[PDB]
Amino acid sequence: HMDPVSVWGNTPLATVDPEIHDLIEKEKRRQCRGIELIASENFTSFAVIEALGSALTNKYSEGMPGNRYYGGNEYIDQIENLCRSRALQAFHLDAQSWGVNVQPYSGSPANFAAYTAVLNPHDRIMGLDLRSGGHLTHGYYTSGGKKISATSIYFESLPYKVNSTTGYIDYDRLEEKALDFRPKLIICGGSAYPRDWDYKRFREVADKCGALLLCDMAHTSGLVAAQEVNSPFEYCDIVTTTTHKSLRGPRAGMIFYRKGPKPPENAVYDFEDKINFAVFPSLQGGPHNHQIGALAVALKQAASPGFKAYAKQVKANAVALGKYLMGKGYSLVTGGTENHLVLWDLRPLGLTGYKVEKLCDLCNITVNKNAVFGDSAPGGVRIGAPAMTSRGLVEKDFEQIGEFLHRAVTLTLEIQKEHGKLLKDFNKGLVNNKAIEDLKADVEKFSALFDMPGFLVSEMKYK
Amino acid sequence: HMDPVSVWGNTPLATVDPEIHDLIEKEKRRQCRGIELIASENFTSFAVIEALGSALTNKYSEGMPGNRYYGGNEYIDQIENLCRSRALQAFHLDAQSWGVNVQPYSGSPANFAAYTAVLNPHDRIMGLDLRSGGHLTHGYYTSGGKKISATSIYFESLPYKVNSTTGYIDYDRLEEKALDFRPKLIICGGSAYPRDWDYKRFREVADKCGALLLCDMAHTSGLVAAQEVNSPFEYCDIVTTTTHKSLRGPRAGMIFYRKGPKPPENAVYDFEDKINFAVFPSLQGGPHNHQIGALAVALKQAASPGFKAYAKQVKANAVALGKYLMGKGYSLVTGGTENHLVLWDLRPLGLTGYKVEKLCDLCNITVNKNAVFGDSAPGGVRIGAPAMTSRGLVEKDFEQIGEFLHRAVTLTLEIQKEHGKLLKDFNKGLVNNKAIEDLKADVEKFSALFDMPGFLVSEMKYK
Amino acid sequence: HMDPVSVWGNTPLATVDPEIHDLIEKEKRRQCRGIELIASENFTSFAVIEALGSALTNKYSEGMPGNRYYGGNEYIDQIENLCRSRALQAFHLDAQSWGVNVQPYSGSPANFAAYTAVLNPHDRIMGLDLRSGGHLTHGYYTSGGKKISATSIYFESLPYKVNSTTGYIDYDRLEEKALDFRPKLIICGGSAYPRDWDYKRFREVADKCGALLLCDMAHTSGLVAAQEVNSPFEYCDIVTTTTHKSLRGPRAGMIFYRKGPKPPENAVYDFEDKINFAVFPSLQGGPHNHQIGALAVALKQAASPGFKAYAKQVKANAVALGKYLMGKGYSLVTGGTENHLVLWDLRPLGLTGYKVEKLCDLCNITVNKNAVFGDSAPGGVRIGAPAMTSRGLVEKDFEQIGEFLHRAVTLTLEIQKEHGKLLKDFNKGLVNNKAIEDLKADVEKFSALFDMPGFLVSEMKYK
Amino acid sequence: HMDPVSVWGNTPLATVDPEIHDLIEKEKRRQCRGIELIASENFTSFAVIEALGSALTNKYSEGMPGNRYYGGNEYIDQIENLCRSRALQAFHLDAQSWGVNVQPYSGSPANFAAYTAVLNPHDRIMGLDLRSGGHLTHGYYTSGGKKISATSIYFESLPYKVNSTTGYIDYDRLEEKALDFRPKLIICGGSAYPRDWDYKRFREVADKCGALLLCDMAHTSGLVAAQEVNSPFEYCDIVTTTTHKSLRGPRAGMIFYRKGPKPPENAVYDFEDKINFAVFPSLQGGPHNHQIGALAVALKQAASPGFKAYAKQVKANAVALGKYLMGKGYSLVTGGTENHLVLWDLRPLGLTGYKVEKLCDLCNITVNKNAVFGDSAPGGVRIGAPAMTSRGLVEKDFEQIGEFLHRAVTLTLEIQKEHGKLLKDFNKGLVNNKAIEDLKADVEKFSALFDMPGFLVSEMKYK
């Protein structure tokens, strides 16, 4: 009574699962009929999507290429080798001095595997405070001492912060902190920091306290590949990353690590085996070979002249957006940007990030509420350029986005003035708001004028 | 100088990345021109592959449906809700008594998140010993006390084993062990156990020592959904699983957990919030929404009449294979099977699992070497039925596979007799071996006669 | 308005503190007007007591002799050196192969310092189960997994047990257990085991699993010094001890450790520095120099011909007592003794250890209730020979003690027969019991016939 | 062949052990023929010494009074109860609000037992940095991250420091540190801090971060009993102490803890049972009953009018010494004292603490080298008043001690000027130094003029 392979196995999704097919179509329209400003998002290529959705998902290949536990790995080995060699090329790394492991399921597993490789349970870690622009996997506990991040459950973490008035990393306090706490590992990189990192200074702090130094470059890895921001590879021991943000690839993770002789015992680096062993067999099972193939595709694309121009454009778009906002009287943390995002301090407007985020989301403008230096109800919004830049928007287009944001914050203030400063009141002013429906229509019309990678808009089920 | 969206973003893989496209094509041919007997593998549907390779990879949706940190989740919420409700339906679970989290990136992250949710660092865990058929994520350290599994790095594990002479789980020693070691969590389920599990007895042991009881049903989850083996849901607190083995879905993980009133304070279960919080924000970042959509598809497919028939066929095929092997004088661990695999003890033949695995791999027969009870160089091979059954093979076809295995072990013995019992010698007998080249040709001819899900063979680049 | 030094500082205790002086006098009478059978007790010499109560208590001398943090240590150094060299002599240890640290405040700190020296937090330890005759500092958690012993809080312990029917250590289960659990440290020695230890076998088990081996010889250290039981020094890495039980010294602890070349890298032992550093500065402050002086005295006394004869007598007295008990139909665990104690199984009499202990304590016979193999309300009493042997009792005197115990258990049964088997009932039968008052008078009369070390009975305040 | 009880057991030390007896006599002379300025030392009463050296050492009494595991404790219970009730009286504590455990073997075991009672392994602790005047048991690791203190091995510690320029505790940095690190326990009290503690402010910091607050009052407990410094009992949850420094008792420890209703659930304090259980059975075995009797004596003595006058004198003597030093141009940390010690900063003289300590020790002046705020070879000496004040020295006598110190530092400078600033050179100037031999003779003559508690100088073997 078994179904024929043609019926269950070869039939397209639109017949097998209409419900899911319909929902994907609506998500496809949503992605191209709004303004996507989530700084951790991007629209990847169709080529990447074709590798991701391939028979590569069927192959179970525990181990490394050339040291696998089962047979039949002739072509999976070649894909993984190509993915690794392309990873080194994309970041201009000499293979004698750097290795990479491309099996992490995602960025957060890449981080935790890196920790497991070089630390023992309860070893001390320092990372950029969440409220200062850091990331959950770098450590996070609450004021009640509740350990939220797994990094803070299995290791002992302590955050360093930005200067309270300037919004830049306080390198003097970082150093004083590291000399007190004596971390075995210092993490640099972050999720909502709008400036570049002084990796040289991090290296100096690390050397002074006897720490390893790791960069989580998840957010800016695309800018790093195109050499548009400082490279962490010059000064860090280990570099982890996600592959889907500014790098514009699939959802995956990578761990880069130093190889060969150490700088001034005639000693050599010892990370390669520990890192690989941490990924498998300690933490992961078989790799997601479709992710590795998709990632190999993304890495080749990342090494093209067009990608360096894209990374330049991402930077120029964020700058032109920020300058447009500041021209309207708005205040940005650090007063500008050097990367892909702006951090908009709304406290001078009497507004909360949540209120602006909610109203923007009603106009199909997706940003995210975000903490700002000394927040104690986050008081800012975080806006990123990668996704809309991938759709071909240039500086003039990002100035229009700034106008849309300007219109949106204006509607937020008019609501707050009319209905009240309490969240209960603010909501009353959204109901049947003509002005909100008008901005929504303009956003959708503006959004619809640009192209869209990954799927053909002239094949969409909803237009 | 940016590339047009059409050039980099809409162009097919075969133009963007010829190398990777070619390698995927060869892997596609390899998958249908050999005999795939790795018990942890399957060939998933094309519908699953279409959801997996979709614009769903572009959406970042940290949190749970209805409690997300960013906007634009209208359709992702609906996909995740449908995936969860289908997960409960597929395993015949009342929603008032069971919840499920579908965000784990894979099976090994699902396990570790479950541990994190209910245990503190260094809590004691018991699982099926690796050499007795268990899995790395259930705990593993070596005789030198080297902690291999992350489960054994961050927690205190102790394995229980099968009876040395029968190959069945020794439930008496399990109970004596648990009463001595007092684990906070007992794990059941395994990777290479050929019999069903007595979950009732596990529950009795767990109750006697005050332990939680978790089933990792990764290998048999398809059989569990079709109610062809014992359900762990009747007796376990938590059930984790991978979704790509006998379940025939994408690579993903799920964590099921009890809800509602406890059995005999009028107390209720407390797993839902801990489990969800452990997945996010403690360990993972944003979910892989394309995996969740693909998984939702697989779960609907798993709930069809054809899937119950497929699970019945998997069981019948493994049994008919085992009986064919034993009819040739071969010995199976426990003398048969009740699930999807057979475990073939090669020590009575004077052979090592590696030697049979190597020669089978030369004939495009992929099995894996596997330990057998008291091994001290694994002495068996593990053979599974799910993948070839997905291609439509029935019992007569699995008897022919048994003949191919019989021919292969015969060629292995002829080599060992001629060239020697040392691994160095065995290899000498592979070079330009006509007889090996003949079995390979028969395997490829037999393999080519069957259909193949996930991609159309009449569109293959290599035929 | 300060008191003159003569008034507060030179005045005797009997004037400064009549209350405390009176209470010490009553304790002195109690010690010599009853029968002391607590196996962990002894009556030390007056010489030991004079060193203990000396100006040595005034000196603070952090560090080791020859490496102190402060001046004025000329004579404290010499006392500590003499105490250490006498410690090696007392146990017939070559100084090139063994070192000793004499600063532990007591036996339990000596154990914990030894653990700290050679283990990391959460390392695995195995020791003799409490219910099988072991000691709390070797590890103890309850059936609910509550960690009682600090050894079980800061380290991971697992107990091994005696055979359930014979009462001897089950060396086969010990080995099977150690190969499963892989402890970093195995502890031998115990508090209520009546037989000698097979240290050679412990060494074999330890070598097979890669464990350190430590003996806690607190109870039998006097017998060890006199070479009347097996020496742990032949086979263990570390030997800890208390100094006041069968060794007949002050309350103090010592840690012995191997030095010099290892047995078959041309490697040497590495315990000396770790051990010393663990005692100070990790765990302890300045040593109790009066204890070290008293201990030096006890060690010289322990090296006299009279002490070897005393240790022989202790053994002969316990044997003659046990034989007297068994002649009356009583049952001893293992059916006898090879050391200083007997373990009396009262379950064949229908009696609990508590009931016999309580009634004996009413007749000034101090024993202690004690678990027996498989107890699930301890079912035995533990009786030791050191204290009464120190008062000069020989075999005939210990046969009379056996008669007193025999009379006491007879009164316990007569009470249980008349009033009932519930603890509530048993108590009713103690009130104004003539027969109990008669045994008490005979015990006190018999007790008063012997001499008493440490203080002059003909100077007692209460006679 | 056993020795008679009279021979080994009643014979005095001077016959049993001439070596040890002779060495104690020389230590007795050393104690009264020099100037003892070690701040952690005292000369206790003869009454204390008589209880310490008594048959109380023979009794093994595991448990608490009224809940013991063995019989024969009638009089030991009464001694322990009296010792506890006297402990509460001595510190003016209401029994309904405070309990005390008097079994800790010493101060360092009292601290670790307190930690064990209220913390889990790896909980965070903050204490006064060693270099700022704190104590090893409050936490200590080196710049290489080597964990020295057991407090830093089993728990996670972070030190707070004194202000770099004033030498007072930096309460602002303490609070900022505690809000970052979130310790579960903050420790106050120290070994070389010359000022009082603002426990109210510590309580404020503790409340703000959700921490327990513990005072280790080992050094100043005598001053605390006499109400001559701030009481930690007003604001701390737990108070530990040693009993032999300014308290002038035996070597022992105590743990005080709050009882009864908490200040603003109608909740009550929960320390009593945890504290008692941590002492026994978790960490310690049977208590040292002779210490408890001696301590009971010391506590009664501590509650006399003469003791309050003695504590006043200690404070006045340290002040008069400090003023004398500063009158000679010397510099003290914080410019004076409020307690029993002065901390003398020698860096303005171009001298190291070791050099002054070494030369003082050659003149029978025992001080100890000590770190000073920001030291990076300690640069100070720590001098304490309790011991010499116990011999009856008043302010005029401490001015003469200041002159002796002045003469000694003068001889140190003359040596450094003649022979050199390298330690190698300084030593050359000690050989056959007439001037050093002259100060030694004056110190011994001055020292001999005063009385001496604990033993009669007119019975000394060496005069």
XYZ file of C-alpha atoms in Angstrom, chain C residues 1-3 5 8-14 16-17 19-20 23-24 26-28 30-31 36 38 40-47 49-60 62 68-72 75-76 78-79 82 86 105-106 108-109 112 115-116 121-122 135-137 146 148-151 153-155 244-245 248 250-252 277 280-291 293 296-297 300-301 304 306 309-310 313 357 361 366-369 389-392 451-456, chain D residues 1-3 5 8-14 16-20 23-24 26-28 30-31 36 38 40-47 49-60 62 68-72 75-76 78-79 82 86 105-106 108-109 112 115-116 121-122 135-137 146 148-151 153-155 244-245 248 250-252 277 280-288 290-291 293 296-297 300-301 304 306 309-310 313 357 361 366-369 389-392 451-456:
242
model
C 42.120 50.347 84.479
C 43.755 47.210 82.984
C 43.995 44.034 85.039
C 49.053 40.263 84.127
C 44.020 37.610 84.389
C 47.064 35.953 82.819
C 48.817 33.824 85.439
C 45.880 32.793 87.611
C 44.893 29.110 87.373
C 41.727 27.950 85.633
C 40.131 26.796 88.892
C 39.450 32.217 86.667
C 36.608 29.975 85.487
C 32.239 26.698 85.901
C 34.517 25.352 83.179
C 32.858 20.622 84.082
C 36.320 19.376 83.102
C 33.284 15.758 85.842
C 34.402 14.812 82.316
C 37.618 13.454 83.867
C 33.259 10.133 83.480
C 36.281 9.089 81.422
C 34.816 3.465 76.758
C 34.046 4.073 70.955
C 37.596 6.277 67.394
C 38.566 7.255 70.928
C 41.659 6.913 73.071
C 43.203 8.358 76.241
C 46.445 10.129 75.357
C 49.513 10.591 77.538
C 50.120 13.361 80.063
C 53.244 14.324 78.108
C 48.706 16.984 77.069
C 51.534 19.136 78.480
C 52.819 20.000 74.982
C 49.283 20.686 73.758
C 48.639 23.114 76.633
C 51.784 25.234 76.260
C 52.970 28.631 75.086
C 53.282 27.020 71.624
C 49.692 28.175 71.063
C 50.962 31.801 70.993
C 53.171 31.477 67.881
C 51.843 32.290 64.405
C 52.535 30.664 58.312
C 58.229 31.206 56.539
C 56.598 34.592 55.997
C 57.628 36.123 59.351
C 60.558 35.999 61.751
C 60.987 34.455 65.187
C 62.356 26.962 67.671
C 59.017 26.365 65.925
C 62.911 22.732 64.953
C 59.743 21.352 66.526
C 61.380 16.923 64.516
C 59.545 11.372 63.769
C 44.212 20.861 61.818
C 42.552 17.415 61.924
C 39.058 15.745 57.758
C 41.112 18.829 56.715
C 40.289 17.658 51.870
C 42.082 16.119 47.404
C 42.684 19.773 46.616
C 36.895 20.533 41.167
C 34.403 17.883 39.986
C 33.861 7.540 56.288
C 31.948 10.739 55.505
C 35.008 12.524 54.077
C 21.456 15.367 48.392
C 26.130 15.568 52.357
C 29.916 15.289 52.357
C 31.969 18.244 51.142
C 33.870 15.620 49.148
C 29.843 18.724 46.943
C 33.130 19.824 45.369
C 34.013 16.502 43.683
C 44.334 10.672 68.067
C 42.686 7.302 67.549
C 47.104 7.777 70.784
C 46.616 14.810 70.022
C 43.824 15.861 67.705
C 45.697 16.625 64.480
C 50.705 24.349 48.807
C 49.090 26.477 53.025
C 48.318 28.865 51.483
C 45.228 27.425 49.735
C 43.194 26.081 52.668
C 44.797 26.768 56.074
C 46.294 29.717 57.852
C 49.019 29.446 60.457
C 49.447 25.965 61.917
C 48.452 25.045 65.451
C 52.002 24.799 66.765
C 50.887 23.316 70.092
C 49.293 20.435 68.124
C 54.501 19.775 69.465
C 55.886 15.161 67.923
C 55.598 13.802 71.457
C 58.213 9.453 69.712
C 55.964 7.528 72.073
C 58.735 2.791 71.580
C 55.840 -0.448 74.623
C 53.121 -4.264 72.571
C 50.137 -1.971 73.109
C 47.284 -6.022 72.895
C 23.557 1.874 72.418
C 25.002 4.445 77.664
C 29.743 3.906 75.404
C 29.516 2.120 72.054
C 28.004 3.513 68.868
C 25.209 2.294 66.637
C 43.520 -1.177 76.340
C 45.299 2.122 77.011
C 44.060 1.785 80.606
C 45.833 -1.568 80.850
C 44.633 3.201 85.961
C 44.151 6.198 83.691
C 46.689 8.132 81.584
C 46.711 11.891 81.016
C 45.723 13.018 84.532
C 46.275 11.697 88.050
C 55.260 -6.432 77.533
C 53.077 -3.286 77.714
C 54.358 -0.237 79.565
C 50.105 3.479 82.528
C 54.041 6.225 79.456
C 50.755 7.877 80.455
C 51.318 9.833 83.677
C 54.971 10.817 83.328
C 55.589 14.533 82.706
C 56.772 15.837 79.345
C 60.179 16.840 80.733
C 59.057 11.596 78.341
C 60.405 13.954 75.674
C 63.428 16.037 76.703
C 63.959 17.332 73.163
C 60.447 18.740 72.818
C 62.409 23.433 72.612
C 59.215 24.657 74.298
C 63.408 28.170 74.457
C 60.216 29.304 72.707
C 58.915 30.449 76.105
C 61.952 33.897 73.061
C 58.378 35.059 73.660
C 56.409 40.897 69.536
C 53.044 40.651 64.711
C 47.947 38.594 64.383
C 49.569 37.404 67.602
C 48.780 37.554 71.293
C 49.778 35.884 74.572
C 46.763 34.079 76.009
C 45.975 33.424 79.650
C 47.195 30.498 81.726
C 43.554 29.625 82.382
C 46.105 27.090 78.410
C 44.906 24.825 81.250
C 41.585 24.119 79.488
C 43.339 23.640 76.155
C 45.716 21.079 77.674
C 43.137 18.871 79.407
C 41.416 15.501 79.171
C 38.836 17.258 76.951
C 41.089 16.239 74.053
C 40.015 12.599 74.643
C 36.288 13.049 73.878
C 34.869 12.468 70.388
C 30.281 14.430 66.486
C 24.852 13.875 69.007
C 25.524 10.546 67.321
C 27.082 8.820 70.369
C 26.563 8.769 74.126
C 28.631 10.072 77.026
C 29.481 17.367 80.225
C 30.738 18.145 76.714
C 27.310 21.717 78.845
C 30.742 23.061 77.903
C 28.243 27.611 77.790
C 29.257 33.205 76.290
C 38.968 24.192 63.970
C 40.372 27.659 63.123
C 40.156 29.646 57.790
C 37.877 26.578 58.257
C 35.184 28.036 54.179
C 30.903 29.766 52.225
C 29.836 26.148 51.846
C 30.401 25.825 43.895
C 31.444 28.599 41.467
C 43.159 37.985 53.658
C 43.954 34.878 51.599
C 40.680 33.140 52.515
C 46.710 30.932 38.965
C 45.959 30.370 45.038
C 43.209 30.576 47.639
C 40.812 27.656 47.993
C 38.141 30.361 47.991
C 39.533 27.433 43.450
C 36.025 26.389 44.460
C 34.311 29.774 43.992
C 43.355 34.002 69.208
C 44.287 37.432 67.870
C 43.222 36.695 73.260
C 42.925 29.744 71.960
C 43.355 28.903 68.295
C 39.773 28.244 67.159
C 25.322 21.282 58.652
C 29.312 19.004 60.501
C 28.789 16.666 58.737
C 29.909 18.289 55.447
C 33.414 19.508 56.266
C 34.542 18.614 59.818
C 34.554 15.525 61.948
C 34.365 15.596 65.719
C 35.120 18.955 67.312
C 38.265 19.726 69.270
C 39.646 21.140 74.446
C 39.576 24.145 72.083
C 36.604 24.624 76.608
C 34.651 29.280 76.640
C 37.267 30.443 79.140
C 34.286 34.821 79.837
C 37.586 36.644 80.164
C 35.303 41.349 81.951
C 39.581 44.494 82.445
C 40.225 48.443 79.319
C 42.764 46.226 77.538
C 44.812 50.313 75.661
C 61.767 43.004 58.803
C 64.213 40.133 63.445
C 59.182 40.647 65.090
C 57.137 42.624 62.588
C 56.104 41.460 59.142
C 56.652 42.905 55.698
C 49.811 45.386 75.394
C 48.900 42.020 76.921
C 52.257 42.179 78.735
C 51.186 45.464 80.322
C 55.387 40.474 82.938
C 54.145 37.620 80.793
C 50.819 35.730 80.823
C 50.322 31.999 80.241
C 53.388 30.680 82.107
C 55.379 31.822 85.131
